[PDB]
Every structure is written in structure tokens, then in C-alpha cells.
Design a protein around this ligand. Structure first.
Ligand SMILES: Cc1cn([C@H]2C[C@H](O)[C@@H](COP(=O)(O)OP(=O)(O)OP(=O)(O)O)O2)c(=O)[nH]c1=O
Ligand SMILES: [Ca+2]
Ligand SMILES: [Ca+2]
Ligand SMILES: [Ca+2]
Ligand SMILES: [Ca+2]
Ligand SMILES: [Ca+2]
Ligand SMILES: [Ca+2]
Ligand SMILES: [Ca+2]
Ligand SMILES: [Ca+2]
Ligand code: NA
Ligand code: NA
Length: 898
DNA sequence: GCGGACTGCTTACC
């Protein structure tokens, strides 16, 4: 096989590289890397190297890397540009791997681990590591084994060995329900004291040194705790054994510590999740996320965690094993590790650099330029400046019965490729007219020769740009994976349909590739399968869709981040001229097509001057299709699915070609390199046929709800609500309130005013029986100490921060009580006046039951009235007033009758 | 006593 690196580090004049060789075996080499940097040279000096602008450069080979850096410093002191890749690790990877890296992930050692630390006096600070590590479960992806390190003897209690027999048993058997599929993969190692455990773990670590190291909060807790515990007990020299190159770096931010283990790529899964999952969670405990991702139950245990080991060591160890497995399960679904490996090996960077799109792109562009013997520019210092972004239309707050949406494919990257925007493709500038002059095709055509953006920039049309070139490569990967996703999604609905008439028989789920649309044979067979087989296929379909979703939405994130990078001062190719060129072109593009779409629809409908586009954000338009429906009349339709097919055919056969023409014209207007403004229909929304549902509504910018029947070619078996911006979508809104508001919205859009009022009346009556967590608000807890004046709210103290202070005062003096962590999220509850807490609200760590110390008092003093009106009624008022509805039956003259 | 303007903070949408 082809060789591929695992990890790379720069230690002084040495490059330390772990890699897999041609025989598939992991090796480690210390290379005295001789890096090259470049300087401009006279035209007469013959060379093969040029900067991106065509200026010749002479290559300076250096004896070592530290000499190359000192030269950069000198070139600064002289006042001359020092060109080339200054991050020598990247240069090394580029040299050593001069080809598209094909990697075998089975050879890459991925370690999932989690430790347990019993602490009687609150949260065990990793920087201190005062308390013994009494459990470590370490899963090795190569061995496919869970290595369990169990401390039987601790100053906090002596316990018996964990029983794998009891662990396997059902919880109803007094067992721990450790998944049967991993029972045989567990390797249990009890220890009679902490020192022997840690030394054995270190030796274990050396034998099976992690390449990818992950888990939940491993970077903020596990790794630094383990490192500091081993450091405190055995000394710094043995603690460094955690690094295959025996070098670590303690980065301090008081005290807080993030330890850097050279030779290991740490991908904390909480960070992978926060960056790649595109969720915003009320809590980020592994418990909460697992329940959300895997629909598994919360890990139930009786007492407090600080006593769990003493009371139920059996379950303590079992839960530790499960916590490791749950991350693996989440990763099996989300596939963020795979994503990081793909992106990482594609860019030729340290795998952990996937968290930095700038670093990611700097390397991609660098490697692409190195291919053509071209020399990258030196990074420069720039002041941060604001610059304009997208256009968002101000919608008329109202209900909207029939709505079709249209969205541009990969907008900003497409703008980049179309205009050919790149640092080295800048041709010059032109005198700009007001933006609306270009929108209305009134302004003079910017250039006859160059490709233009209405911001004033001109670009060469002939030559290829390294930014368009490399953004196009990644975009193609994105388009491919989105295809698999949508197909999985479409296949999902097919199974959902067949699940309406499940055949009474015993069979097995069909072997199919869900990434591709089911064949007619497959669809025929599906209608004959049982519920068990169908539900299993629906599950695999959804799993395939999620896998496709991760691959596509994150490649989309990467290319959109290339745009964003252009507006970031730390990007080597930062340039507001290009960034604004993109956004301004974007603003034009959207509003140009708004006019075009309006003109076409007035034309084909027969109307004149009517506004068909009711809303738009960046690259989308929402078209009021009431008159398209009415020109045929509701009468001529069999069922709801009929007019959905009608609008589907209409958008596809009539509107899209018109849009294609409208954009193709715009492309000539700007004299762009290549027409890439591809705006396809997205949503088809409307009420059920013959129902009293309103279909949809807008309350303002970025706030709307639609009863969608079809989405990008996916015909749902049951209509799906597309709600944007509204409280139902906000993590800050209580779970039960989201659920209730959503049902309110559903009823408005699908059933009508009478149905809404009915549900509202019922909710108002019964809502006081809702669990306190389900009605608690959520908020991030930033700058608590900023507003902490003697335990009391300082000036301008935010509501939720006030709640935290109230909490701190209530639990003052309990070391065992859970502390609110700065930056993390909290549940927030209003308190009725005269409550013994002394304030109008309270707050506690999210994802947890509030401590038993004060729980019963909080429950008794919750302000349900405030909770209802503030959280439920007020947003519902906004929804209904916008939609011209009432959630309560208004008073009439008819109230004088019986 | 408090509504309106403004600010800080939060979390949405692209
Ligand atoms: C979602 C998102 C969009 N944007 C900008 C750039 C996008 O091109 C533009 C449109 O956003 P989107 O239409 O949401 O995403 P997209 O058009 O780029 O790709 P597609 O629609 O085919 O799935 O908004 C960002 O800069 N960052 C983001 O996270
Ligand atoms: Ca734990
Ligand atoms: Ca059970
Ligand atoms: Ca011993
Ligand atoms: Ca889209
Ligand atoms: Ca888009
Ligand atoms: Ca059937
Ligand atoms: Ca969009
Ligand atoms: Ca099209
Ligand atoms: Na220490
Ligand atoms: Na249906």
C-alpha cells in the first residue's frame, strides 16, 4: 500500500513523524528537516519559482528549521517579504507525501477513553488532580477491545471486583445492561492501588499509543487530569510518557490547563460534536447527548456521583464502560472521526487542525500552489474591519397559504467560481454605481473584458484561480455526498409509506445500498416485508442519511469557511476586496432574481405589479403561490398530493428555466467566467387540501413556519413543519414549551383557528403538572463573576445570571453541591414573590436535576404564571398576531345568548 | 410609576 503519516510534530530542528509504511506497519522517524523559504529576486536571475503574482523568487535552503525562522525575523527587520510555508510541519508533509493520500483507517490507532475520579469536595480540578483516578476505560480501535482499569482500593473506599456477569444482566435482574455486543470485548484489570494502575496504564499506553485520541471532554478533563495526576505522583518525566516523543506542553489560562501531547492528535468528541453536528444543545453532558443521538435511557443511579463508587462500585465501573461505548455509538452514527481523517489527509495537515478551516485551507492552497512550483505569499498583519454581508428581505408579517421556495446551490462558493475570485486573479477595478442600478440592469456594464462583482472588483476570466480551483474540488465531494443523503432521505419516505401496510410474516430486512434510490424490484419487495424488517430498514436508511449529512454539510461548512477566511485577518489570503466582492455579488444576485421571478410570475399568471416573492435571505426566495394555485382553482385537484405534484412540475418545468435565463443574463451583465448561479426549488408548502389550516406564516426576518409537503425532491409521507427562528427552534426555550408551541403551530398551519384555541385552552389548564425541567428555560452562563457583587446581582445583571447568584446563595456551604460552571449552560426558573431564595429567579447546571438540598423548595416556589405568559403566551401572541389568528376566542355580541 | 430608547446578552439564520 501507499505510505501515509499518522502524526507530525516540530521539536526544534527535528520533525517527529509517526507513520504507516508500505507494509502497513507503524513506524516513527526523527527527520532533521531542511526547509526552504523564498525571497523575491531580479527578473534576470533564472528560476523555476514564482509567487502567485508571477514575480520570480530564489529558493533559500536552510540547514535547519530554526535557521529558517531566524531568517524570517531578519527579513522583517530589513523590511522585505519572506515567502513560502512558514509552518514547517506542513512543508514536511507536503514534501514527504507528494500525492493524494489514500489511508487505511484500520491501521490508525483510535483510542476512546474516559476516567472516573471520586471527589467528596466538589468537582476534581484537573490542574490540581488531588483525587485518585479510580477507573479508566480505554477502547482501542485496532484491538477492538475495551481495556478496563479498575481501582479496588482507594482512600475513599475499598470495593470488590466488578462482575462482568452482573454487568451483562438486565437492570431488571439487578444488572447494569452493558450492551451484549461489547461484553466479549471487555478486558478487565483490577488493581490493589492507584500507583500500580497508572504505571500499568502507562505501559499499556506505550504498547498501544493512540494516534487519534478521543472521548467526552477528554481535552478539558481526562487528559489533563491523567497527566497531572501522573505528574504529581511519579514526577514530570514519567508523565511525559503520555507523549510518544516524550514532549508535552502545559498551556495555562487561570487555574486552567490544556496539556498538549506531542505526537498525538487529540479530537475531543465534544469539540467535534459542537463544530460538525449543527445542533445547539441545552446541555452537553454525555448523558444528555447520548439520549438525543441514540435514544437510549438516562443512566439511572440512586445516590450522588460522589458516592456512587462507595455504594455501587459494580454500576460505577459499568457506567464508565458504557460512557466510552456511547461515544463510539455516537461516532458510528455521526462519523466525525471519519470526517476528520478525510479532511485531514485531504489537506495534508495534523488531524486536529480540522478544527481550523484557515489552517486547513492554508495547507490545501499551499499544496496546490507547490504543485505548480509556485510560492505562497507571507502572512501579513491587518486591522479588523467590518464589511457588508447578505441581504435579507423584510417580509410583510402575515399568513401565507401556498408557498414555494428556491435556493441557490452552494451560493458563496459558486459566486467565487463564477466570478473567478482569487488573490492572484484580481484584474483591476471599475467605478461602481449604486447597487440597485445593477439589480435593475440600469448601470453601465462594468467590464467588457474582465469578470466583475458589483463591489468594483474585476478579475481575469482566462486564467484559473487557486481559490476557485480548490474550492471546486471540495464542492464536488460535497455534491456527491449530498446526493447519497437525499437518496437515503427519499428511500426513508418509501419505507415510511410501506409501514402503513406491514405484511404479517417473518422475514429479514433487504440488503440494499441506501445511498442510491431504491430500484423498482426493491420497492416491490419492500411492500411485502413485515414491520420488523421495515422498521429496521427505516433505521438503516436514516443512519445512511445521517452519514451522508455529516459528509455533505461539513464539506459545505469547509468551503463556506474559505469564503469566511477571506474576511479573517489571520488568513494568508485575507482580502476584503474579495470578501466584499462575494457578498455584494450575493446581494445583487438575490435581489436581481427577486425582480426576475416577480416579472415572470406576473407575466405567466396574467397579473401585473403583484409581489410574488414574499421573503428572502442571502440566496433564497419564498414565492407566494396562491395565484398559481388559483389560476387552476382548488377544485381541479384530487387530493393534497395532487397540487403538490402540480407546483413541483410547475417549478421544475416553468420557473427554474426562467430563473436559469435570469441568472444567465446576469452572468453576461457581469461578464463572469462561468454561469454557476443554480437556483432549484426547495420547499413546497401549503395547508392540507380542504382543511382550515393556514399553510404558513412569517412574523418578521428569519422567523417563519411552513407546512412542507416536499423538500428538494423528497415527498414526505406526512407533512413536515419547517419552522425557522421561532421559539420552537431555540435551545433556550423549555422542552415542553417547544413541544406545545410546535403543536400550536402545527394546528394553525394544518387545522385552523378553532383547533389552535382548543389546544391552547387544554395546555393552559394542565401545564402546571409538567415536570419542572421540561418547563425550565436554558441559557449560557457567561461572565458570572462580572455581575457578582457580594453574591448579589450587580448593575445590568442578566436575568439568568441573577438566577445563578440566587443558586450560589442557596447552596452556600455545601461542598457536595453542584457548582455552576462558567461558560456552560443553566436551567432557569422564575420564583413567585416571597420565596425563601430572596430573588425572582433561580438557575442551576443544565442537563441535571437541581440538588436535593433546595429542590423541593424550588418546585414549591416556581412561578408557573410567569413561566406560562413569558415563555408560552408571549411567543404564541407573536405567532398568532402575525398570522391574523386568535388563540383565545374573542368576546362577541353572541355572549348574550345561551 | 413606567414606556420608549438603548444596551448587553443570547441564540437564532444565512
Ligand atoms: C449556512 C452558512 C451560510 N453561509 C453563507 C454562504 C452560503 O453560500 C450562503 C447560503 O447559505 P446556504 O444556502 O444555507 O448554504 P449554501 O447555499 O452555501 O449550500 P446549499 O444551500 O446548496 O446547501 O450563506 C455562511 O457563510 N456560513 C454558513 O454557515
Ligand atoms: Ca463518568
Ligand atoms: Ca431495561
Ligand atoms: Ca500490588
Ligand atoms: Ca438548498
Ligand atoms: Ca443555498
Ligand atoms: Ca405491505
Ligand atoms: Ca439558503
Ligand atoms: Ca435547475
Ligand atoms: Na502538578
Ligand atoms: Na401521504
Amino acid at each position: 500500500m501507499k505510505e501515509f503519516y499518522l502524526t507530525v510534530e516540530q521539536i526544534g530542528d527535528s520533525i517527529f513523524e509517526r507513520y504507516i509504511d508500505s507494509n502497513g506497519r507503524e513506524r516513527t522517524r526523527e527527520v532533521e528537516y531542511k526547509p526552504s523559504l523564498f525571497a523575491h529576486c531580479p527578473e534576470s536571475q533564472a528560476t523555476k519559482y514564482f509567487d502567485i503574482y508571477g514575480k520570480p523568487c530564489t529558493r533559500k535552503l536552510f540547514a535547519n528549521m530554526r535557521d529558517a525562522s531566524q531568517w524570517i525575523k531578519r527579513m522583517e527587520d530589513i523590511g522585505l517579504e519572506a515567502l513560502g510555508m512558514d509552518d514547517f510541519k506542513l512543508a514536511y508533509l507536503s514534501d514527504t507525501y507528494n500525492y493524494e493520500i489514500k489511508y487505511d483507517h484500520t491501521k490508525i490507532r483510535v483510542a476512546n477513553f474516559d476516567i472516573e475520579v471520586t471527589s467528596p469536595d466538589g468537582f476534581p480540578e484537573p490542574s490540581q488532580a488531588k483525587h485518585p483516578i479510580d477507573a479508566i476505560t480505554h477502547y482501542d480501535s485496532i484491538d477492538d477491545r475495551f481495556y478496563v482499569f479498575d481501582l479496588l482500593n482507594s482512600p475513599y473506599g475499598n470495593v470488590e471486583e466488578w462482575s462482568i456477569e452482573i454487568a451483562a444482566k438486565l437492570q431488571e435482574q439487578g444488572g447494569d445492561e452493558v450492551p451484549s455486543e461489547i461484553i466479549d470485548k471487555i478486558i478487565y484489570m483490577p488493581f490493589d492501588n492507584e500507583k500500580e494502575l497508572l504505571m500499568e496504564y502507562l505501559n499499556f499506553w506505550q504498547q498501544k499509543t493512540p494516534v487519534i485520541l478521543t472521548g467526552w471532554n477528554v481535552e478539558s478533563f481526562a487528559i489533563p487530569y491523567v497527566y497531572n495526576r501522573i505528574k504529581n505522583i511519579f514526577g514530570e518525566s514519567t508523565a511525559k510518557r503520555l507523549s510518544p516523543h516524550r514532549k508535552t506542553r502545559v498551556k495555562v489560562i487561570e487555574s486552567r490547563e490544556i496539556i498538549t501531547l506531542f505526537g498525538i492528535s487529540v479530537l475531543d468528541y465534544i469539540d467535534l460534536y459542537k463544530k460538525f453536528s449543527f445542533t445547539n444543545q441545552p446541555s452537553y453532558s454525555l448523558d444528555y447527548i447520548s439520549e438525543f443521538e441514540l435514544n437510549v435511557g438516562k443512566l439511572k443511579y440512586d445516590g450522588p456521583i460522589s458516592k456512587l463508587r462507595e455504594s455501587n462500585h459494580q454500576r460505577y465501573i459499568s457506567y464508565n464502560i458504557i460512557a466510552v461505548y456511547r461515544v463510539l455509538q455516537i461516532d458510528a452514527k455521526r462519523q466525525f472521526i471519519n470526517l476528520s481523517l478525510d479532511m485531514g489527509y485531504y489537506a495534508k495537515i495534523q488531524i486536529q487542525s480540522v478544527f481550523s478551516p484557515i489552517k486547513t485551507w492554508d495547507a490545501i492552497i499551499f499544496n496546490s500552489l507547490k504543485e505548480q512550483n509556485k510560492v505562497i505569499p507571507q502572512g501579513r498583519s491587518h486591522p479588523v474591519q467590518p464589511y457588508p454581508g447578505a441581504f435579507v428581505k423584510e417580509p410583510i408579517p402575515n399568513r401565507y397559504k401556498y408557498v414555494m421556495s428556491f435556493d441557490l446551490t452552494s451560493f458563496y462558493p459558486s459566486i467565487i467560481r463564477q466570478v473567478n475570485i482569487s488573490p492572484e486573479t484580481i484584474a483591476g477595478t471599475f467605478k461602481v454605481a449604486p447597487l440597485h442600478d445593477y439589480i435593475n440592469a440600469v448601470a453601465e456594464r462594468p467590464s467588457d473584458v474582465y469578470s466583475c462583482s458589483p463591489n468594483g472588483m474585476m478579475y481575469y476570466k482566462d486564467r484559473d484561480g487557486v481559490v476557485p480551483t480548490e474550492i471546486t474540488k471540495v464542492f464536488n465531494q460535497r455534491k456527491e455526498h449530498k446526493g447519497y443523503m437525499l437518496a437515503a432521505q427519499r428511500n426513508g419516505e418509501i419505507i415510511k409509506e410501506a409501514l402503513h401496510n406491514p405484511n404479517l410474516s417473518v422475514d429479514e430486512p433487504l440488503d440494499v445500498d441506501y445511498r442510491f434510490d431504491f430500484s423498482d424490484e426493491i420497492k416491490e419487495k419492500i411492500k411485502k416485508l413485515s414491520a420488523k424488517s421495515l422498521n429496521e430498514m427505516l433505521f438503516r436508511a436514516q443512519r445512511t442519511e445521517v452519514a451522508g449529512m455529516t459528509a455533505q454539510i461539513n464539506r459545505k461548512l469547509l468551503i463556506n469557511s474559505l469564503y469566511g477566511a477571506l474576511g479573517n485577518v489571520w488568513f494568508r489570503y485575507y482580502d476584503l476586496r474579495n470578501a466584499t466582492a462575494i457578498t455584494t455579488f450575493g446581494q445583487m444576485a438575490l435581489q436581481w432574481i427577486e425582480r426576475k421571478v416577480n416579472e415572470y410570475l406576473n407575466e405567466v399568471c396574467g397579473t401585473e405589479g403583484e409581489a410574488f416573492v414574499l421573503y428572502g435571505d442571502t440566496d433564497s426566495i419564498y414565492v407566494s403561490a396562491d395565484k398559481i394555485i388559483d389560476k387552476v382553482g382548488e377544485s381541479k385537484f384530487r387530493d393534497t398530493n395532487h397540487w403538490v405534484d402540480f407546483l413541483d412540475k410547475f417549478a421544475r418545468e416553468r420557473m427554474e428555466p426562467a430563473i436559469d435565463r435570469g441568472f444567465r443574463e446576469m452572468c453576461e451583465y457581469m461578464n463572469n467566467k462561468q454561469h454557476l448561479m443554480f437556483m432549484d426549488r426547495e420547499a413546497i408548502a401549503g395547508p392540507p387540501l380542504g382543511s382550515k389550516g393556514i399553510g404558513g406564516f412569517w412574523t418578521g426576518k428569519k422567523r417563519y413556519a411552513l407546512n412542507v409537503w416536499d423538500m428538494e425532491g423528497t415527498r414526505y409521507a406526512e407533512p413536515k413543519l419547517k419552522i425557522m427562528g421561532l421559539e420552537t427552534q431555540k435551545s433556550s426555550t423549555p422542552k415542553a414549551v417547544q413541544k406545545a408551541l410546535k403543536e400550536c403551530i402545527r394546528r394553525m398551519l394544518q387545522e385552523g383557528e378553532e383547533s389552535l384555541q382548543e389546544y391552547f385552552k387544554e395546555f393552559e389548564k394542565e401545564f402546571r403538572q409538567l415536570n419542572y425541567i421540561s418547563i425550565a428555560s436554558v441559557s449560557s452562563a457567561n461572565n458570572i463573576a462580572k455581575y457578582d457583587v457580594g453574591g448579589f446581582p450587580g448593575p445590568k445583571c442578566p436575568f439568568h445570571i441573577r438566577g445563578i447568584l440566587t443558586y450560589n446563595r442557596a447552596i452556600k456551604g455545601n461542598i457536595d453541591a453542584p457548582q455552576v460552571v462558567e461558560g456552560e449552560k443553566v436551567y432557569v426558573l422564575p420564583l413567585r414573590e416571597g420565596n425563601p431564595f430572596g430573588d425572582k429567579c433561580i438557575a442551576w447546571p443544565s442537563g441535571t436535576e437541581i440538588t436535593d438540598l433546595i429542590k423541593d423548595d424550588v418546585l414549591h416556589w416556581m412561578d408557573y404564571t410567569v413561566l406560562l405568559e413569558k415563555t408560552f403566551i408571549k411567543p404564541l401572541e407573536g405567532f398568532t398576531s402575525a398570522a391574523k389568528l386568535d388563540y383565545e376566542k374573542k368576546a362577541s355580541l353572541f355572549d348574550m345568548f345561551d
